[PDB]
C-alpha cells in the first residue's frame, strides 16, 4: 500500500 | 498549541523572510531547539486498519481506523493504549491483555513492514533530550502528508522533492531537511529578522495552509 521512502 | 503555531508562521511569512535585500539565513540557527520526536516512516493501511509509523527513537504507534490508537515502545514490550475519548492506558505485550491481541498483533505486522521496506528519515540526526507522543490525526493533499503530533509538533513530508519540515510551537521553532537531506533548525524569531531563502520560504507559507486545515477540523 501507500508508504514512506 | 495548533492556535499558537498559526500565530508563529504567520509573524514569519508576514515579514517577507525571502524578500530581504540580504539574507542571512544561517544566522537564524539553533542547534538546541533540535526535535524530541519526529516520524522516520509509515505505512497507509486506512483501506483496512489505519495509519501505521515509526519515531525516531524506533519506538512504533498506528491510529486505527475506530479512532483508537496504539504504541509499542523501543523495549519492543511496553504498549499505550489511547481510546477514542483520549483514555490513555499502559500496559505491557507479555501481560497477554486478551482484549489488545489483534491490535497488537497488526501493530507488530506494521513494524515488520516499515522494517524491511522503508528508510528511517533523519537517520543522520541526534535529537535533543526529552511521555511519548502518539499521532492525532493526519492526512494527504496532492502533494505532501501532514502529521500532527500529540506533543503539538506537525510533520509535512513533501511528495515531489522529499523535503520534510518538522515544526513545534513549544519551541517555536522549524527544522528544515531538504532534498540533500541535509538538516537544519531555525528559530521563528529569527528567520523573522535575519531572513532565509526562497525555498524555505514558501515551504513555511504551505505548512500555514496545513494548519489552516488542521484548525478547520
Redesign the interface.
Known sequence: PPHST | HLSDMLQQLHSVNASKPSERGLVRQEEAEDPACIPIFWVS?????S?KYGLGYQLCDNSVGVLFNDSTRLILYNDGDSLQYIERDGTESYLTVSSHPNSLMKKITLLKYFRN??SE???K?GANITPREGRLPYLRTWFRTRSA?ILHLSNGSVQI?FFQD?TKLILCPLMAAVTYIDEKRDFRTYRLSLLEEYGCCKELASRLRYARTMVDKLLSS
Request: proline share 0%; no cysteine.
Open positions: 516512516k509509515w505505512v497507509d493501511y483501506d513492514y516499515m521496506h522503508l528508510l528519515a502528508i513530508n522529499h
